[PDB]
Design a protein around this ligand. Structure first.
Ligand SMILES: C=CC1=C(C)/C(=C/c2[nH]c(/C=C3N=C(/C=C4\NC(=O)C(C)=C4C=C)C(C)=C\3CCC(=O)O)c(CCC(=O)O)c2C)NC1=O
Ligand SMILES: C=CC1=C(C)/C(=C/c2[nH]c(/C=C3N=C(/C=C4\NC(=O)C(C)=C4C=C)C(C)=C\3CCC(=O)O)c(CCC(=O)O)c2C)NC1=O
Ligand SMILES: C=CC1=C(C)/C(=C/c2[nH]c(/C=C3N=C(/C=C4\NC(=O)C(C)=C4C=C)C(C)=C\3CCC(=O)O)c(CCC(=O)O)c2C)NC1=O
Ligand SMILES: C=CC1=C(C)/C(=C/c2[nH]c(/C=C3N=C(/C=C4\NC(=O)C(C)=C4C=C)C(C)=C\3CCC(=O)O)c(CCC(=O)O)c2C)NC1=O
Lengths: 169, 169, 169, 169
């Protein structure tokens, strides 16, 4: 199920979020079941933007070996709340993007929730600067999610095997 | 599935919508699969409000014979667009309510869609001032929906049988 | 003036706000300069609503003795933040209404800010269950506003002299 | 003044708007009174963005010869309405930006309105690819604004005299 009961949670975000250090490539390690990622080998590339915010380039290897991509823009509409962002993708409506925790150098936890009456629809990914994350960090970012309701048993481990994700090199 | 592909449509609404005549009791005849209606015998009661807009009282007979109810408030945030309303229910986030077509005296078609990136989540009900609607009107309000994408084959015919909905009298 | 430099602040609101004990009649003691109050002797009557939230009745005397009034509906769009309400006045667009402090029985502090780029337009009023309030309360509620950037030297003391306000039976 | 009575209009926008042909340098010819332009010789440079939308560079001369500038990002939040854009300027909150008419090669009409209860605050500018525009074009774009309530007698002609604007290499 993608519509989970209950309204959107209001989890804590990363304090003094430095977007400049958050830039670069991030590998999807574990993700909540979503409908936008239709393949595996997912990567998020955050690069510089001429105006405000940063740019977004997302890539995945579909099962047919085809690499699908989406471009987008990221802005924190409240500059005093830099970790709560709004992501504007192509052919898409504005979606929320909240950095809950990151070291900028190894791990990152991201959350998106849109309210639907008394139900909600959420997106979550555990990302790494490498195609793998230590199990300790995964178990700790999984506890941050369990703390505000997420069934960390619904999490899907994204395939990042070097031989399968070879077209993404 | 409750998350359908594609963004929210922008269908046409009832012209010169008179909310005063739309007040009263409406019976659910056919509805898109939703998560808020967990029973049958659904009824919508729109009554007067002391300030702006009108009040909302929704009732259904659950399978245990229990009548569940929800109260709410309805406001058209744009007075020059009176058919595009916002419904504020209890323990719920603000949801959209658009009257697409009504005679005020027999039939009414309602639509709610919230965007979720490149996907959407929608609610739809064909309502009648009586527990039944003629099949001609159902087939015509079903064509208005087919015209903007709705799979009118996903529609659920709400049970309004007099003997089963007897606790709602 | 009315459009002041700087984005809107996000002040703290009253905790465990009870809109039921907030119901009744509030008299304007002091107000930030605004464009909707074109008179004095102002009163805000918060009443009950059949649906969600409370009803609004705002009354004031103009310099020509005429009593002008407005009706509106008040709704907390997030039930988990019931002190951050939205006010839907007649012939008017949705405007914010935040109860920052209230003892329900004597005083209340209210703030409204809409963002206008790098500037803002704000409304704030100190209210009482009586046509007067003690200087100690006025001075502490002024210190709360001062903490978030409000020039308390721009505030205007509303006229609540029973002789001037005699048309308010 | 700046806060004018009445809610915001919903004017018509340019059809099949091409943001690519809209890119480049636009000079301010005439403008509605606003609080962000504190000088003259104004220019808006619309450039390319690595993600969604275009970049913004707004430049003006102050009475003291200093050239003040702002950077921002422009995004059409609804891809099916690309002429209704949102502008995210630096140190500023999201503000609306609507291209109502443009031939891309000579003229453009732009409007912004945020609602302030039963009042409103609006921004509008007539732009040219040259520091001047023909009276026939100015007069037709004034008639478009006049159709939706804009007092064209409040408009201000921006100074684009090459001698005064000499600091703009
Ligand atoms: C409910 C919230 C919600 C979010 C957050 C969201 C994001 C989002 N991700 C997308 C694609 C994508 N998103 C990713 C990857 C990621 N995306 C991430 O949020 C992160 C951190 C990764 C992980 C690396 C990839 C690889 C694509 C491209 C998929 C494709 O083109 O097939 C798109 C493009 C539209 C689409 O193809 O469906 C959107 C809007 N959509 C939503 O509905
Ligand atoms: C995606 C949009 C969307 C809408 C529109 C929506 C409406 C909505 N309908 C509700 C209940 C209800 N709604 C109805 C009935 C109706 N409801 C109607 O929209 C109409 C026209 C009928 C038909 C008569 C009933 C009977 C209940 C009470 C269900 C219960 O309490 O068990 C509630 C209360 C919260 C809940 O119990 O889930 C909401 C928010 N929720 C959404 O997520
Ligand atoms: C930027 C935010 C903002 C707010 C909050 C706002 C409220 C607001 N107050 C109004 C009327 C009014 N408002 C009040 C009274 C009050 N108002 C209060 O919120 C309180 C506490 C009092 C004081 C007791 C009165 C008396 C009127 C009617 C004035 C008249 O009709 O002459 C109206 C009706 C529109 C109008 O008459 O112009 C609005 C929208 N307007 C805005 O632009
Ligand atoms: C209510 C709506 C609204 C809008 C649209 C708006 C735009 C806007 N224009 C700005 C700067 C600016 N705006 C412009 C120029 C232009 N601006 C234009 O949209 C166009 C067409 C020109 C003219 C060519 C310039 C030159 C500056 C910088 C002024 C300076 O720094 O002194 C800023 C930065 C904040 C500031 O410097 O105060 C904003 C938010 N602000 C608002 O409040």
């Amino acid at each position: 199920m993608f519509i989970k009961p209950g309204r959107c949670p209001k989890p804590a975000v990363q304090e003094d979020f430095d977007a400049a250090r958050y830039l670069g490539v991030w590998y999807d390690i574990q993700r909540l079941p979503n409908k936008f990622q239709k393949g595996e080998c997912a990567t998020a590339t955050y690069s510089l933007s001429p105006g405000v915010g940063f740019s977004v380039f997302n890539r995945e290897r579909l099962a047919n070996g085809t690499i699908k991509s989406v471009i987008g823009s990221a802005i924190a509409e409240d500059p005093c709340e830099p970790a709560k962002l709004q992501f504007f993708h192509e052919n898409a409506a504005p979606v929320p993007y909240w950095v809950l925790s990151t070291d900028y150098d190894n791990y990152a936890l991201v959350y998106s929730c849109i309210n639907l009456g008394a139900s909600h629809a959420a997106a979550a990914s555990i990302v790494s600067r490498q195609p793998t994350l230590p199990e300790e960090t995964i178990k700790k970012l999984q506890g941050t999610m369990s703390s505000f309701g997420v069934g960390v048993d619904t999490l899907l481990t994204t395939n990042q095997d070097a031989a399968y994700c070879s077209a993404m090199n």
